[PDB]
Design a binder for this molecule. Structure first.
Ligand SMILES: *[C@@H]1O[C@H](CO)[C@@H](O[C@@H]2O[C@H](CO)[C@@H](O)[C@H](O)[C@H]2NC(C)=O)[C@H](O)[C@H]1NC(C)=O
Ligand SMILES: *[C@@H]1O[C@H](CO)[C@@H](O[C@@H]2O[C@H](CO)[C@@H](O)[C@H](O)[C@H]2NC(C)=O)[C@H](O)[C@H]1NC(C)=O
Lengths: 38, 38
């Protein structure tokens, strides 16, 4: 599945988790607002 | 964590539940929309 803000939850910043990897997380709704009135 | 409409669910009116307290549940979508539309 696509990694999104509905499939995942956020807790803290990125400097704590030993194995954290940089990747894009797609935000539903936030993209839509741009289509509605860019 | 902040109490939001994603963390809780809604069922019924504020009368039957014993010991219900008044507070604000923060809906993220409305907050964004009041910025998007201005
Ligand atoms: C994940 O991304 C962050 C930035 O979003 C990277 O940290 C920055 O890396 C640049 C070089 O590309 C530096 O100039 C910045 O000073 C860094 N900032 C911080 C706060 O570290 C981070 O290295 C990336 N991690 C991986 C594994 O790619
Ligand atoms: C939560 O807020 C509601 C109002 O939105 C309160 O309802 C009022 O209660 C007082 C008595 O406490 C009545 O005189 C008002 O007529 C009520 N108004 C409405 C619109 O219901 C409710 O009491 C509050 N609850 C708590 C625990 O503070």
């Amino acid at each position: 599945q696509i990694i999104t803000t509905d499939n995942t939850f956020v807790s803290g910043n990125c400097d704590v988790v030993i194995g954290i990897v940089n990747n894009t997380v797609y935000d539903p709704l936030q993209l839509e607002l741009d289509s509605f009135k860019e």
